[PDB]
Amino acid sequence: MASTAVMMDVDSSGVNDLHHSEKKYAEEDQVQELLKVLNEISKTTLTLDPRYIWRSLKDLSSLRNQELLNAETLCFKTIEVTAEINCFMHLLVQLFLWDSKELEQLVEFNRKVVIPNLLCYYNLRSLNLINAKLWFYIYLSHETLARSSEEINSDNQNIILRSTMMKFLKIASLKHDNETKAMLINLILRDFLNNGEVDSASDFISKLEYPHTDVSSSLEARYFFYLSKINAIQLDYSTANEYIIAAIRKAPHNSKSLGFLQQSNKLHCCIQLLMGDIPELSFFHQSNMQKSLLPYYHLTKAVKLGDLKKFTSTITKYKQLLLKDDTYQLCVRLRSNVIKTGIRIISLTYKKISLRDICLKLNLDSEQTVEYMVSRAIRDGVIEAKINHEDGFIETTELLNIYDSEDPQQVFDERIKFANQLHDEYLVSMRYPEDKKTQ
């Protein structure tokens, strides 16, 4: 029972014992695997009263009991080292709100776990056995504050934490000191997304991606996730989406697809908006609103027309939901964009239309702001036309070519450049059986 609970952890420690003698890939991925199966046993009734007794005994095990806080009494230096650390890993696991509610207790514990005899020698030894999420995933909760008077001061524990993560960013020595890292960024990112202005993300950019391989595509996507949101008000759209496009593409998430990928999708949906593309939410009908899309759809629904009021109405309606996702900042722009979009379409299809007939769409809307409004539109390209008011003729271009240009062959080049994608990758993985079969 607690036995079997312990027995599982015995296997974990037994697999920790694998890593203990130089064997992570087993251990970590097992620990990874263990992290999931961790939900099973969970709790910590006799698992720990039997753990703190099974392993060995250490001062910190005592200070850990301050987190335990209970009564058992009863009767009943090596193996009890990183196991204890690996259990401090599970300590954090005992903190999930699994076996906890207020980790603000555990906050200090975390430090008092993190900082002492830990966050010390571990550079290549601990391999992302740090979970700074599960470090912060704790603090994540409490950042429901509100309450804290943030934090302490303002809010320095987080500033500290940032600096502490910074204190890791040093510790990210790239000795392999990586994996967990840009969660730190991601934290800081979402910390920006909490308050700060990401743009130092550019510095965070400037450092790195979570290099590289063994990082969870999840994070690597979650990397992109915020990293998308960089370009959000960085107002790069593709790349933002490309992140999403590199995030949802192969980030592995079903359980976490649920609330969390919606988020992704939300901004993702928000992307094509940035481009005014309005894909068919005909899919985004599905696994969406419910709780995510449909305002986006309403947006799309509006953005299909981009009818400012009807547009605004959605916003008018969903602003809080927007506000809930802070996609509100968006769309304030695509308003006239779609207006200008329509302006472009089923309309520019003459080599003109007039001033006033194209002004008619503005005679539908406004006048001689047209001049601006058209220049407003022409300004961006995003249409191609000309005018002369001296002509009063809003002169709407071809947009007509052939592939005479290198334009296709650009794409061919684009295709060409990709010729190495799977081709060079085949060699990227050629190794593994081929090389391990030698073993």
Binding site: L323, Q329, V332, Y372, S375
Partner: protein
């Protein structure tokens, strides 16, 4: 947490300073500061001074400045302390429009452009356009070349005919060669 103190023109300040940032013509940072902002709309809408740049940006970003250019002329903060960028912005406004006119118009009556520039003297305009170095005959701003085409760099790639292609060949040949 800073309810500890708080103050009012703090709004005006950033308002000015966003409008500054706005005049400073750094868009994302401008907006990402709105993003940076702790309470945005709660703050924002509650400040006309903050409500200029946004509504402006609406006007601004895509390029119709009509009321905006008027709005700031009417702006109580422009009326209060802000006129610093107001004029700055006006230019900064029109340079876009200048390109927009450029885009929109090969040729434009030196009237219309001025009318677009909200100028009174067209020599006002004329300077710009010729500062812009715009082909101009009587009464009319022209764009014979609306753009910068050629002008040195961005070469050796993106329009190297076989060269790239050959490089690409060479590349693909290295996709053939690095194929080891």
């Amino acid at each position: 947490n800073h309810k500890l103190s708080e103050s009012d023109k703090k709004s005006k300040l950033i308002s000015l300073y966003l409008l500054n940032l706005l005049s400073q013509n750094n868009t994302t940072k401008f907006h990402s500061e709105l993003q940076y902002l702790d309470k945005h709309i709660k703050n924002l809408e509650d400040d006309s001074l903050l409500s200029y740049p946004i509504k402006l940006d609406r006007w601004l970003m895509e390029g119709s400045y009509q009321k905006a250019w008027d709005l700031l002329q009417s702006g109580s903060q422009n009326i209060s302390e802000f006129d610093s960028f107001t004029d700055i912005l006006k230019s900064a406004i029109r340079d876009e429009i200048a390109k927009n006119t450029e885009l929109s118009y090969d040729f434009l009556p030196l009237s219309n452009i001025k009318a677009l520039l909200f100028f009174n003297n067209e020599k006002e305009t004329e300077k710009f356009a010729l500062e812009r170095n715009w082909p101009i005959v009587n009464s009319k701003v022209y764009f014979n070349n609306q753009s910068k085409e050629k002008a040195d760099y961005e070469d050796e790639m993106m329009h190297e005919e076989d060269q790239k292609t050959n490089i690409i060949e060479k590349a693909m040949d290295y996709a053939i060669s690095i194929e080891n």
